[PDB]
Amino acid sequence: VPRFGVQTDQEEQLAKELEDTNKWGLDVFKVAELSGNRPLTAIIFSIFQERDLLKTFQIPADTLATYLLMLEGHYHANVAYHNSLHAADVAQSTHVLLATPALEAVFTDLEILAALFASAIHDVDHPGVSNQNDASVLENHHLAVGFKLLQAENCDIFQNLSAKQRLSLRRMVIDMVLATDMSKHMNLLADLKTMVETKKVTSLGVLLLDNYSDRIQVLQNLVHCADLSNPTKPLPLYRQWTDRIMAEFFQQQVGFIDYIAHPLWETWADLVHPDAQDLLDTLEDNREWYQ
Amino acid sequence: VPRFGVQTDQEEQLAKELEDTNKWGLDVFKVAELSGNRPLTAIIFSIFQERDLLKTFQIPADTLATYLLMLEGHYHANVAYHNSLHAADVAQSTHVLLATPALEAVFTDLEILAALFASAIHDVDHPGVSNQNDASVLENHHLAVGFKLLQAENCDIFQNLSAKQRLSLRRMVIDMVLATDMSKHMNLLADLKTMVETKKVTSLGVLLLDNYSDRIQVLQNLVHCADLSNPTKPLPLYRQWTDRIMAEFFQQQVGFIDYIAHPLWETWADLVHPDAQDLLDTLEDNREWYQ
Numbered sequence: 171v172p173r174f175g176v177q178t179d180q181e182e183q184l185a186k187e188l189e190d191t192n193k194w195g196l197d198v199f200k201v202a203e204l205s206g207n208r209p210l211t212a213i214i215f216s217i218f219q220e221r222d223l224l225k226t227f228q229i230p231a232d233t234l235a236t237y238l239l240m241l242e243g244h245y246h247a248n249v250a251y252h253n254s255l256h257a258a259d260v261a262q263s264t265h266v267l268l269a270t271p272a273l274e275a276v277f278t279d280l281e282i283l284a285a286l287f288a289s290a291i292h293d294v295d296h297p298g299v300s301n302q303n304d305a306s307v308l309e310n311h312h313l314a315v316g317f318k319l320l321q322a323e324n325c326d327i328f329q330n331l332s333a334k335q336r337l338s339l340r341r342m343v344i345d346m347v348l349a350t351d352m353s354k355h356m357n358l359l360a361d362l363k364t365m366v367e368t369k370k371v372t373s374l375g376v377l378l379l380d381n382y383s384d385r386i387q388v389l390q391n392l393v394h395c396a397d398l399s400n401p402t403k404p405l406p407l408y409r410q411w412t413d414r415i416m417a418e419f420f421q422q423q424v425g426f427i428d429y430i431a432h433p434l435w436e437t438w439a440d441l442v443h444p445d446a447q448d449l450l451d452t453l454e455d456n457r458e459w460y461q
Numbered sequence: 462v463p464r465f466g467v468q469t470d471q472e473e474q475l476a477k478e479l480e481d482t483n484k485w486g487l488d489v490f491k492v493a494e495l496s497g498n499r500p501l502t503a504i505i506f507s508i509f510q511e512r513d514l515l516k517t518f519q520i521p522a523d524t525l526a527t528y529l530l531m532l533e534g535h536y537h538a539n540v541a542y543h544n545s546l547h548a549a550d551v552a553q554s555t556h557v558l559l560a561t562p563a564l565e566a567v568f569t570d571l572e573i574l575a576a577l578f579a580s581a582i583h584d585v586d587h588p589g590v591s592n593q594n595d596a597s598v599l600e601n602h603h604l605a606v607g608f609k610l611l612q613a614e615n616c617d618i619f620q621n622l623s624a625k626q627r628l629s630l631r632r633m634v635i636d637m638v639l640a641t642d643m644s645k646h647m648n649l650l651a652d653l654k655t656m657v658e659t660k661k662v663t664s665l666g667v668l669l670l671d672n673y674s675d676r677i678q679v680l681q682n683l684v685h686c687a688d689l690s691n692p693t694k695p696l697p698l699y700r701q702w703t704d705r706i707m708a709e710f711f712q713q714q715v716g717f718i719d720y721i722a723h724p725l726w727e728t729w730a731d732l733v734h735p736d737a738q739d740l741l742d743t744l745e746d747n748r749e750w751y752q
């Protein structure tokens with residue numbers, strides 16, 4: 171099994187680029203190229219190794235590679251934005267958000283594993299916005315696909331988790347992937363604002379979420395924020411995401427930053443102040459049309 | 462009837478801004494504000510007056526105002542991108558493309574009127590990309606709505622056109638609005654490339670389209686280009702369009718510039734060389750992620 175589960179000629183440059191795995195400014199587009207166009211597999215391996223998750227949950231390296239290669243293969247490369255690169259970006263953003271100082275020692279390794287897995291499969295088999303009941307049918311499909319692939323030969327990365335752990339993780343993953351459904355945005359934001367107003371921090375300045383009910387609300391918002399993190403990334407990266415979104419948009423009052431991204435990121439920023447101010451500053455920069 | 466069919470307090474600044482009606486860089490967002498949020502009505506009046514179309518086709522000023530106010534009212538303000546501002550922008554872009562030196566004296570006043578009308582109604586009553594037979598059902602709906610509004614009291618702006626002219630214009634309008642259906646993009650581009658290869662210019666350097674069959678192909682591509690002109694506009698404007706598209710996108714290989722906008726604009730540029738090189742230069746600037 172290759173260093174990052176992927177086979178590439180420029181494995182040297184790939185490793186160097188992946189040194190920014192813990193950074194919000196990671197150039198995932200560069201990772202995509204250097205990984206032989208397998209950003210998701212490379213990113214998840216880099217993240218898992220960084221968090222020592224393979225050893226913690228006894229996830230066989232070859233099993234992870236096989237599952238990821240198969241998962242990444244179920245994202246449609248012809249779909250401009252909702253492809254494995256977006257999945258890799260969301261997982262990596264989730265990884266950094268989880269490492270926020272304000273959330274230190276708040277989540278268990280299982281909750282962390284669930285958030286990263288959810289991020290990895292959250293848009294799998296997306297057919298494209300123009301080709302997409304009324305109860306998160308699409309997000310439930312992403313979950314179904316992400317889960318079914320675990321049943322393939324040598325693909326069950328959770329084989330060494332107890333039944334109790336699998337039940338917990340499955341439930342959390344479902345909750346987080348369903349939280350990426352934009353129709354749930356307004357209600358999720360309301361919940362987050364409530365978490366902010368009733369926030370409680372220790373003397374060390376760390377959030378206090380002793381109750382699971384509160385933990386899952388934060389985790390849902392965290393992954394939702396990761397999914398909507400494009401505008402908080404450096405302009406060069408944001409413009410590339412924007413170019414992809416427009417291609418998918420055209421494939422066969424008003425404003426994204428003002429009405430969707432800002433209200434959400436400002437609230438998240440309040441939850442972890444001062445940890446996310448840099449993101450708001452970047453958002454503000456990207457909002458300056460004439461700058 | 463007000464100077465531009467719309468009632469506003471800053472009519473003074475509106476007139477000044479509309480002095481750029483013949484310019485590709487027009488700040489339509491500014492026009493929207495200065496017109497009391499009625500960009501389409503203001504822009505069409507400015508264009509029609511500029512081309513002296515009201516006198517040419519005896520279009521009563523009050524009739525035009527009533528029709529436009531009603532048409533603009535059928536665009537959904539809550540739809541982030543596909544609203545009356547996009548319609549105004551496409552009509553104004555069509556106006557400038559038609560004035561291209563290479564197309565001087567090529568089209569009749571009726572063909573010009575049809576192209577501008579088509580641009581004005583081309584997306585009317587659009588419900589938003591996430592809320593949108595297989596034969597341009599949506600574009601045919603835009604046409605149905607645009608046409609039905611002409612039947613309202615004092616709304617028939619074509620009342621003074623002969624039956625022969627109405628038949629011709631109706632046919633051309635249908636052809637141009639259907640040409641905005643992205644599923645027809647590839648075939649339209651093929652047609653345009655054929656128009657380019659078999660191009661014929663006079664000694665004065667003006668295109669020769671003596672045959673209607675060729676005229677309609679160029680007109681269809683012209684309005685299609687107008688609909689896809691966002692990336693050829695100055696970055697500040699492009700970023701605002703992009704922000705609107707992303708909001709609509711999220712409302713409940715790969716790349717827009719590289720695979721959709723460039724192949725089309727390069728072909729158009731060949732048709733009218735050197736008239737549109739500035740647009741390609743701007744497109745190139747907007748394609749520089751790190752610039």
Ligand SMILES: [Mg+2]
Nearest residue numbers: 292293350351
């Ligand atoms: Mg999704």
Ligand SMILES: [Mg+2]
Nearest residue numbers: 583584641642
């Ligand atoms: Mg349209």
Ligand SMILES: [Zn+2]
Nearest residue numbers: 292293350397
């Ligand atoms: Zn997503």
Ligand SMILES: [Zn+2]
Nearest residue numbers: 583584641688
């Ligand atoms: Zn349009």
